[PDB]
Write a protein that binds this ligand. Structure first.
Ligand code: PEB
Ligand code: PEB
Ligand code: PEB
Ligand code: PEB
Ligand code: PEB
Ligand code: PEB
Ligand code: PEB
Ligand code: PEB
Ligand code: PEB
Ligand code: PEB
Ligand code: PEB
Ligand code: PUB
Lengths: 164, 177, 331, 119, 172, 58, 162, 162, 162
């Protein structure tokens, strides 16, 4: 699980050295950017419900063919799986937002996704429609701190650019 | 390989919820106690071979059958590897001081070491003695109470940090026995 | 440690440090610097010696090869070959072992899988016998295997655990017998050492063993060997069979339980503190109410074959004698 | 976990949990569920079908058998009807989840717990 | 098997020294804590069957999987084995609460249990949810101001919580 | 009592190929109908207790 | 599973002998009574829903406090009624399994084994399910030897519960 | 190790039941006699070296041939005297362990288990040690219940040796 | 019978050794908690009849069908009420026996051993009894450690019944 401190500990471990001042400067930067990351984590854990609700609602507001037939979801069950999957995504954005690297988001969400979305006939562009709705929705300096907003947007962009 | 952050996340992942207020509060206290952990690791790192030298030399002088012919410290090669082993143990303990969770030390070095020292014929009580000397030496450097080095730092309390480092060394010493 | 936490089983199987990868991305020559190459070179010693210790004086052996890796002479394929042919690698792995153990180590060092079937052993033993040691080592490196998996610029890694190599289920489990996680060196574990050939009955007959994860108690089993009956005369005492035929199946499916540390001090019969037979110290079991000097458990590591309805009771009995459970496999 | 042990938070109330841990299931009536804590909204969903504490309570069944309130006998003013949301677009999003229409209303966040255990 | 005292003595003999008076003062302090200890163990031993039952009810209510056909919990046999396992874990947590050391629990219950629940196909995390529920019921029960003379007991609750957390950590 | 008829080949060939313990062999041997006809059915329920507590516990 | 055939084979297996004439006669008689057992299984499978609903109504009329008592275990909740017809449906399905098998195997291995610790640890009462099985024994409406079969297995479950 | 708490736990564990009121009463009594035991452990730890040296001198005065008899086993060499105060030091340490624990566990698992084979295989007679423990019993100089504690465990080691 | 003293002596008897300090400390602690246990036994013995009457009234108010249901097992007959106060009187007497003994011996050997077969074979639900013990737990009116004792043994009988 990648973070600042796991990259530097794993890197000096691969070196075979005790941690010098370089790793200490790295974890110093971790505890500098920490407050903005944790502010974003607080607000995400605050209103995750309404975020996932707006995400799925806009995802079927864009693509209506999802309920058209077998493609996508034509039943209440599949739409329950839809909102559950977006719940998982925002929960991994919360987790990577706490850790401060893209590690848990990568290993839990992104790694080997392609076989799953490919095999189970899941279009990725609808996921991207959901995330690009939530990406746009946040307002700079209207809720979270401006850097927290930056942190959140960065992580969400990582999701999009890792998806398709 | 998990820090304090990852450990909380893994626990909140088994719980399957978001991080939450109580957990973030404790983690804020971790980050506010961050520079003490930084200066702590700086102390143990900038006394490394000093600790390993005094520790293993104390292990030989306490139990002088190791250097007697037939002991496992009887050759230069055996003494070099024993010295090296002490340096590596101190190395991953320093990593567990950085990460705040012993996941790196448990998964990397603690796992399989008892059975290796069994397979080599290394006496385990002597190793736990060496680990104990590194424990007392390391807490004495971490609290600036060394009898040969007293460097100037900002005043503060780090009893909690010391109990944490003593927890990792007691984890290794309990793990080899 | 375990399986469920962290959503990754394979970290907790002891393969935590083997995921890191090394390739020389630098093309041409390295002049002045020597950080990146000394890292890759160190990983080559960590791979080919399998974490064996090389002293500073020893580093003077293989110093020519080492000064040719740094130059445009050897790709790391060929440097790995040069480390493999030298007197060191002969002393540790070739000279100490019988010919078969040597082969299995050479797969752990060079290819990072185990041999799966006897025939792989046929190939390599055949090449050795026809042509000698250098052609043996060439026969590892000069194959489509190494070239395909590593591509000549990447240091070898353990891939025997991985699904991509077709291997065998047997070679997966055998894989974990040969690699015991970070600390264990080539001779660090028992089952390798110097005179042992590690898994022979297992590797030859493709007997899939079991996996004990390293640590968490019961980390060592080193289960006792079996003989073969009246023909090739054997002792029937030491181990439970891997099979369990009929007549006892009734009462649930059969489970092979391996208990690991059995000792007198640990064995108490359920109630804490060591039992004293005489008023003063005679701690062995009285055989016919006359004092015996035979230990209660006579080898450490005895196995139990137990059907399902009898599991609970057996599960209690182990923990009565303070024995620790290595693994349980349905049979 | 080093992070929690060194900086532990305070433990909250325990009244709801003690009400369930104290007496057996026939002694105490309604509380028994007690230990049911709150799952995320998707887990009330039809592949999982989780249960709520309001299901286990007597209040949930509440059905009158032989019963008609006339609502024509009432005085002319005192029939008042209220709609939670007076719109088309917001009663049903394009996707299935709804907080008004269908069985989908079962899977709103909140309301997982129950306050009738006070009796 | 080791309690507090046996762990102190065993370390003191592993180095081969005597106990210092500092050690003896620590022991005396833990003895004065010992009445509160016996009180918590009494509360657990009393209400234990309602703990196991209510915690299993909350488990099957929150996770309706196991009671359904083909579930691990399912069958009369399998349900009874489920309940009994929870009674086992609660019993040994009462034991480690008395000893003051977590050695008996690791030695008799936790160590090797994962190999079994892997070997049967039993979902580990469901067991972990069960043990979290017995931790909630037990900790709350331990903090009851009924029947006991009133006094400060945050350290003992912390320790007891460490024992349950160790049980849920050893199944998962 | 021991005879070619009573003799159990299968518990032998299991016990030889270390498939059971001698304890289960004894448990198994007792359960046999070659024991049920020959030592059990003749005895009064109180007396079959005697041969079991004597021939297993000594 | 405990079928007549498997008792025959299991006994001969523990003796290590063949399946001599005794066990073959056993499997003959099973093959004869099997037909009426199968017809009884057909008709119980036919009118399952009304048997379950009717049995729950008989339990509710015999013990009317159950719907009125506030608790988890009592059938006052929605959930409680679902578990009620759920359990009666289980008893009916295990009876049909024993009719198909021809022995009491599936009831003894799916239902009877460890039923006591469940009825205790959830405070369930033996009488409620006994009254259920009495209504199933009254309302199954079979005739002849098929009725003797279903009455045999239903009565067997009743005498397990007490 | 055999502490009273560990036989309480161990007995209930072998019975599979809980730690009901019997064992809790046991842990109570341990918690009461503990205080006198702690004080006695403090004072034995206080004057250890003079107890051990005094005890060896008592054995030397009681058996004066031992310093005169030329052999490996007797205390004529300087090595022999070192093994002498070494062994008496071991008995004093195990008594302090049993006072701290509150039962006879560490003596029975570190000292008593297998003591006979040692006193035989090195030809060491039980009587010399007995005289040592008699001088320890006289010169410990405790008072009251603490003295009853140390006298209890010291007497117990005496009755182990004979 | 399972008293603490008999556990101590029985354990040392199975080990064949003497009654060393561990078991003696156990008997000490029993002799200390014994006084509060005896006071609790005195007051339960004092107000027995109103506890039994009160408990039967609580069972009748909690389960009002029992007086109405026509049968042998239910308390509609005068005989049934006599068996009702008879059984509640049994539970109260076994609790006082365990208070006097100091362990759960007499309840485990007079009452708990074989109670399941009785509650089954006469169809007596475990729950009715539980309500009785709850009213005894509320109305015994002890205070302090005596109340902790009687609540301990009464709660113990409750956890036996479920
Ligand atoms: C020191 C307190 C010991 C002892 C040490 C010796 N260790 C020897 C060999 C050896 N040690 C390890 C463990 C080490 N290697 C690792 O990679 C890590 C962690 C990543 C650790 C902790 C291994 C794996 C090996 C085998 C490989 C090797 O030889 O380096 C050793 C040599 C033994 C021999 O050849 O006879 C010694 C002497 N020396 C002592 O006196 C005390 C007991
Ligand atoms: C940790 C992260 C994580 C995720 C991100 C999800 C991803 C994911 N989704 C599905 C599975 C699914 N995901 C969807 C979702 C979709 N319905 C549609 O109409 C849309 C195209 C889309 C929502 C935008 C559906 C419908 C299924 C079920 C597909 C099927 O069974 O046909 C599965 C297979 C297992 C299952 O059935 O649940 C997985 C792994 N799961 C995870 O564990
Ligand atoms: C965790 C992350 C997180 C977010 C990023 C926000 C996103 C968000 N914004 C709104 C809601 C809103 N957001 C805005 C913001 C806007 N005003 C404009 O002029 C601009 C277009 C834009 C700022 C750049 C407004 C105006 C509303 C209220 C809209 C309305 O009620 O009409 C809502 C609905 C609930 C509410 O009313 O607050 C949500 C979920 N909420 C979250 O929980
Ligand atoms: C990159 C490397 C790096 C380091 C090594 C640290 C070093 C460091 N420590 C402190 C700061 C501190 N460091 C300590 C630590 C100590 N407490 C004691 O009891 C001991 C003497 C000692 C641990 C062994 C304390 C207590 C403070 C706060 C001092 C104060 O505010 O009074 C500060 C000032 C900023 C702050 O308050 O955090 C800095 C730069 N920071 C870094 O960025
Ligand atoms: C030649 C034959 C052959 C096989 C049969 C497989 C068997 C196999 N599966 C896995 C590995 C795996 N197999 C599964 C499959 C499962 N997921 C579940 O939910 C189910 C229980 C189960 C499908 C029914 C999973 C999830 C992993 C990855 C496990 C993990 O990393 O946690 C591995 C380890 C290597 C890897 O990660 O791929 C191997 C050897 N591989 C082979 O080479
Ligand atoms: C001394 C300690 C000790 C334990 C801790 C248990 C552990 C244990 N459980 C089972 C066995 C079992 N344990 C469970 C329990 C479960 N049911 C579920 O729904 C949950 C996942 C879980 C409860 C939380 C079940 C269902 C079985 C039977 C599994 C089966 O047969 O399919 C078995 C095999 C023997 C048997 O069938 O009883 C063992 C050893 N036994 C011991 O001797
Ligand atoms: C054999 C079994 C056995 C027990 C179960 C205990 C029960 C018990 N506890 C106390 C006594 C006590 N028990 C507690 C405990 C409490 N502190 C709180 O904050 C909580 C409410 C509660 C822990 C959950 C306290 C604080 C005292 C001292 C009360 C006081 O002096 O004010 C006493 C009086 C004697 C003493 O002071 O120790 C007794 C008999 N003792 C026994 O012998
Ligand atoms: C319940 C089912 C069941 C079986 C099917 C057998 C299978 C079986 N056979 C043998 C053992 C044996 N089986 C044979 C048989 C053979 N001789 C040959 O010439 C042929 C190749 C073959 C007959 C066709 C022999 C010779 C042995 C003894 C082998 C030896 O000791 O060398 C053993 C080991 C124990 C023993 O020595 O008896 C077992 C388990 N046992 C069982 O319990
Ligand atoms: C294989 C066989 C088999 C059975 C026979 C059942 C038996 C059974 N019933 C329940 C559980 C239950 N059973 C009932 C049924 C009752 N409701 C009443 O009003 C009546 C007294 C009674 C119907 C006649 C109820 C209400 C519950 C839930 C009790 C509660 O949670 O309070 C449980 C616990 C698990 C659960 O909640 O489902 C079990 C094991 N289950 C099985 O696996
Ligand atoms: C754990 C408990 C424990 C003990 C109690 C001792 C007991 C003990 N003593 C000796 C060995 C010895 N013990 C003595 C002591 C004696 N010298 C005399 O003049 C007196 C008669 C007597 C002291 C009162 C001597 C002299 C030896 C050496 C004997 C010899 O080598 O001749 C030995 C053989 C090994 C050795 O040489 O050290 C042992 C096992 N050791 C243990 O491990
Ligand atoms: C040593 C312990 C011990 C007990 C606890 C009792 C338990 C017990 N009760 C009865 C028997 C009985 N018990 C009751 C009691 C009841 N009446 C009701 O209305 C209530 C449901 C309930 C009181 C709360 C009744 C009515 C009978 C007679 C039942 C009958 O004959 O129909 C019997 C059968 C023998 C008899 O008829 O007396 C037994 C063993 N007996 C013992 O020896
Ligand atoms: C003659 C064979 C021999 C040795 C070699 C030493 C080794 C030794 N160092 C100790 C302990 C020890 N060692 C050091 C480290 C050391 N001190 C410093 O001030 C600096 C700069 C150091 C590295 C150069 C510290 C800091 C301590 C803790 C005691 C102290 O405060 O100095 C201890 C005490 C162990 C314990 O507490 O259990 C020992 C035995 N002792 C011996 O008998």
């Amino acid at each position: 699980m990648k973070s600042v401190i796991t990259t530097t500990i794993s890197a000096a471990d691969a070196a075979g050295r005790f941690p010098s001042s370089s790793d200490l400067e790295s974890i110093q930067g971790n505890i500098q950017r920490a407050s903005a990351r944790l502010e974003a984590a607080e607000k995400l854990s605050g209103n995750h419900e309404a975020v996932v609700k707006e995400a799925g609602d806009a995802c079927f507001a864009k693509y209506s063919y999802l309920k058209n037939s077998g493609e996508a979801g034509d039943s209440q069950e599949k739409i329950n799986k839809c909102y559950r999957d977006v719940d998982h995504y925002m929960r991994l954005i919360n987790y990577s937002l706490v850790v401060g690297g893209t590690g848990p988001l990568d290993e839990w969400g992104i790694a080997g996704s392609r076989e799953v979305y490919r095999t189970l006939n899941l279009p990725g562009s609808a996921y991207i429609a959901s995330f690009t709705f939530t990406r746009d929705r946040l307002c700079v300096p209207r809720d979270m701190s401006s850097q927290a907003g930056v942190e959140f947007v960065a992580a969400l962009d990582y999701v999009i650019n890792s998806l398709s | 390989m998990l820090d304090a952050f990852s450990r909380v996340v893994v626990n909140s992942d088994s719980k399957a919820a978001y991080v939450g207020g109580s957990d973030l509060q404790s983690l804020k206290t971790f980050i506010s106690d961050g520079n003490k952990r930084l200066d702590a690791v700086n102390c143990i790192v900038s006394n490394a071979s000093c600790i390993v030298s005094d520790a293993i030399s104390g292990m030989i002088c306490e139990n002088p059958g190791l250097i007697a012919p037939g002991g496992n410290c009887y050759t230069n090669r055996r003494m070099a590897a024993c010295l090296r082993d002490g340096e590596i143990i101190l190395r991953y303990v320093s990593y567990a001081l950085l990460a705040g969770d012993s996941s790196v030390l448990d998964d990397r070095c603690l796992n399989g070491l008892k059975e290796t020292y069994i397979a080599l014929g290394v006496p385990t009580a002597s190793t736990s003695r060496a680990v104990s000397i590194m424990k007392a030496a390391s807490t004495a450097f971490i609290m600036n109470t060394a009898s040969g080095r007293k460097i100037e730092i900002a005043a503060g309390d780090c009893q909690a940090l010391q109990s944490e480092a003593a927890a990792y060394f007691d984890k290794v010493g309990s793990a080899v026995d | 440690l375990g399986t469920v936490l962290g959503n990754s089983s394979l970290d907790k199987l002891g393969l935590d440090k083997f995921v890191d990868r090394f390739e020389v991305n630098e093309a041409g020559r390295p002049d002045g610097f020597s950080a990146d190459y000394e890292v890759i070179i160190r990983a080559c010693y960590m791979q080919i010696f399998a974490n064996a210790y090389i002293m500073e004086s020893e580093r003077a052996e293989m110093a020519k090869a080492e000064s040719e890796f740094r130059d445009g002479r050897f790709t790391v394929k060929e440097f790995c070959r040069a480390l493999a042919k030298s007197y060191q690698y002969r002393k540790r792995f070739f000279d100490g072992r019988p010919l078969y153990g040597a082969i299995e180590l050479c797969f752990k060092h060079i290819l990072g899988r185990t041999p799966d079937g006897l025939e792989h052993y046929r190939a390599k033993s055949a090449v050795y016998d026809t042509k000698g040691y250098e052609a043996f080592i060439d026969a590892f490196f000069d194959d489509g295997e190494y070239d395909a998996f590593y591509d000549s610029y990447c240091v070898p890694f353990y891939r025997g655990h991985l699904t991509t190599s077709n291997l065998s289920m047997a070679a997966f489990t055998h894989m974990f017998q040969v690699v015991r996680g970070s600390s264990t060196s080539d001779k660090a574990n028992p089952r390798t050492m110097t005179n042992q050939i590690t898994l022979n009955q297992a590797g030859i007959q493709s007997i899939p063993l079991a996996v004990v994860a390293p640590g968490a108690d019961g980390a060592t089993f080193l289960a006792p060997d079996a003989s073969a009956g009246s023909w090739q005369t054997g002792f029937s005492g030491a181990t439970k069979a891997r099979t369990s035929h009929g007549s006892r199946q009734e009462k649930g499916k059969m489970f092979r339980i391996e208990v690991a540390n059995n000792t007198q001090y640990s064995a108490v019969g359920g109630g804490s503190g060591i039992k004293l037979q005489s008023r003063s110290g005679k701690f062995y079991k009285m055989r016919n109410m006359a004092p015996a000097k035979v230990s209660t458990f006579r080898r450490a590591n005895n196995v139990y074959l137990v059907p399902f309805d009898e599991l609970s009771a057996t599960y209690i009995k182990i923990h009565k004698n303070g024995g620790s459970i290595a693994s349980i496999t349905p049979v | 976990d080093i992070a929690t042990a060194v900086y532990p938070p305070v433990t909250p109330d325990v009244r709801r949990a003690f009400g369930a841990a104290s007496a057996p299931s026939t002694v105490g009536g309604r509380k028994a569920m007690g230990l049911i804590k709150q799952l995320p909204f998707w887990m009330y969903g039809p592949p999982f079908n989780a249960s709520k504490q309001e299901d286990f309570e007597p209040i949930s069944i509440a059905n009158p058998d032989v019963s008609s309130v006339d609502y024509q006998l009432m005085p002319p003013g005192s029939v008042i009807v209220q709609p939670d949301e007076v719109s088309a677009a917001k009663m049903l999003p394009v996707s299935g989840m709804s907080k008004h229409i269908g069985k989908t209303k079962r899977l709103v966040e909140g309301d997982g717990l129950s306050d009738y255990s006070r009796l | 098997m080791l309690d507090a005292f046996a762990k102190v003595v065993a370390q003191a003999d592993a180095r081969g020294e005597f106990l210092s008076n500092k050690q003896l003062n620590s022991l005396e302090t833990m003895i004065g804590e010992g009445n509160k200890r016996l009180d918590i163990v009494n509360k657990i031993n009393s209400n234990a069957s309602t703990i196991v039952t209510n915690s299993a009810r909350a488990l099957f209510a929150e996770q309706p999987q196991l009671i359904q056909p083909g579930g691990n919990a399912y069958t009369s046999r399998r349900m009874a084995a489920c309940l009994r396992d929870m009674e086992i874990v609660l019993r040994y947590v009462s034991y480690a609460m008395t000893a003051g050391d977590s050695s008996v629990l690791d030695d008799r219950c936790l160590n090797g249990l994962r190999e079994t629940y892997q070997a049967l196909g039993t979902p580990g995390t469901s067991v972990a949810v069960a043990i979290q529920k017995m931790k909630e019921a037990s900790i709350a029960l331990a903090n009851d101001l009924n029947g006991v003379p009133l006094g400060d007991c945050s350290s003992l609750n912390s320790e007891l919580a460490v024992y349950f957390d160790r049980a849920a950590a050893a199944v998962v | 009592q021991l005879l070619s008829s009573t003799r159990q080949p299968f518990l032998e060939s299991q016990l030889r190929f270390n498939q059971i313990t001698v304890k289960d062999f004894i448990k198994g041997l007792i359960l046999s109908d070659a024991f049920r006809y020959l030592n059990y059915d003749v005895n009064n329920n109180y007396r079959f207790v005697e041969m079991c507590i004597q021939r297993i516990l000594g | 599973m405990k079928t007549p055939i498997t008792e025959a084979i299991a006994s001969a297996d523990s003796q290590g002998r063949f399946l001599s004439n005794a066990e073959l006669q056993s499997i003959t008689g099973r093959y004869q009574r099997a037909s009426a057992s199968l017809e009884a299984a057909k008709q119980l499978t036919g009118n399952a829903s009304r048997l379950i609903t009717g049995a729950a109504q008989a339990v509710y009329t015999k013990f009317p406090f159950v719907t009125q008592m506030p608790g988890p275990t009592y059938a006052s909740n929605a959930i409680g009624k679902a578990k009620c017809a759920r359990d009666i449906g289980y008893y009916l399905r295990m009876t049909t399994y024993c009719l198909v098998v021809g022995a009491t195997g599936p009831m003894d291995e799916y239902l009877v084994a460890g039923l006591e610790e469940i009825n205790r640890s959830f405070e369930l009462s033996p009488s409620w399910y006994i009254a259920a099985l009495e209504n199933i024994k009254n309302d199954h409406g079979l005739s002849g030897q098929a009725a003797n079969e279903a009455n045999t297995y239903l009565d067997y479950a009743i005498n397990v519960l007490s």
